[PDB]
Design a protein around this ligand. Structure first.
Ligand code: KAN
Ligand code: NAG
Length: 246
């Protein structure tokens, strides 16, 4: 298990948590020095439990599929909540089994679904450590509309930060003040599977992408990533979705 406490949190302790999160994900290879997530894990070992504590010390446990980072559901007091999707129902067979009741959320875990439920795109949802504190609090008491927005915050401040060093730094900058994610942040989130695939296709292609990945940069400019010498590959991305799962 990995843990993060919002009480007394700072860029350092958050950095420690994201490091722990990455280190809890199993790999047997690195591709271009980046850990390659496993094709599959069987049984309960497939799911990492993240223990998150809001400022007041209240807690949720979040279940994360270790092969893809995907958060399937969470436990709040004695109630479990899972996304409305086959992978999450499968997760419900292994985690939070001692919960008194199980609620299936009325949406899948997809942005194309969470943004609809929340009533807003995540370009307009501020993220940061204060937002994460809020998200935890929201998820403690069931409210499906509010939970959608909370989950958008949760996903980006945990999973997306684990995958991209840039996103981790974005959140560290938002330690004490929330701000909507940069265009670059959104771009990276949307491109993770694409980038993972192309970095893997590059291993037999002299480090060259079979298909270029288009990203927005930090200055707000749109750029083509064509090979492994790009800063996104050498410095930014921290985890690769296995092509078996793409
Ligand atoms: N991004 C990683 C983090 O956020 C995901 O959310 C995103 C899923 O990445 C994407 O992929 C799958 O999402 C759902 C899970 O299968 C499915 O509904 C969907 N059909 C799939 O495409 C989807 N496209 C958008 C959604 N924004 C997670 O579940 C998660 O908790 C994880 O830590
Ligand atoms: C690789 O990417 C860099 C940009 O990061 C670019 O300057 C260069 O032209 C690319 N090389 C190839 C072979 O595509």
């Amino acid at each position: 298990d990995v843990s993060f406490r919002l009480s007394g949190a700072d860029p350092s302790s958050y950095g420690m948590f994201i490091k722990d999160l990455r280190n809890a994900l199993p790999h047997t290879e690195k591709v271009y020095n980046i850990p390659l997530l496993l094709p599959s894990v069987s049984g309960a070992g497939r799911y990492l439990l993240m223990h998150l504590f809001n400022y007041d010390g209240n807690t949720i446990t979040v279940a994360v599929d270790v092969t893809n980072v995907y958060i399937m559901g969470y436990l709040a007091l004695t109630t479990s909540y899972f996304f409305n999707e086959p992978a999450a129902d499968l997760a419900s067979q292994y985690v939070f089994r001692s919960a008194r009741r199980k609620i299936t959320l009325p949406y899948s875990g997809n942005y194309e679904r969470l943004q609809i439920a929340a009533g807003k795109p995540r370009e307009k949802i501020p993220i940061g450590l204060p937002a994460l504190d809020t998200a935890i609090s929201t998820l403690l008491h069931y409210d499906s509309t509010a939970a959608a927005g909370a989950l958008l915050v949760l996903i980006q401040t945990t999973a997306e930060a684990a995958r991209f060093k840039y996103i981790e730094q974005q959140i560290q900058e938002r330690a004490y003040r929330d701000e909507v994610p940069s265009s670059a942040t959104i771009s990276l989130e949307n491109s993770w599977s694409g980038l993972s695939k192309q970095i893997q296709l590059a291993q037999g292609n002299n480090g060259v992408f079979r298909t270029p990945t288009v990203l927005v940069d930090s200055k707000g400019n749109r750029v083509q990533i064509t090979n492994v010498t790009s800063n996104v590959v050498t410095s930014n991305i921290q985890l690769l979705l296995n092509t078996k799962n793409i």
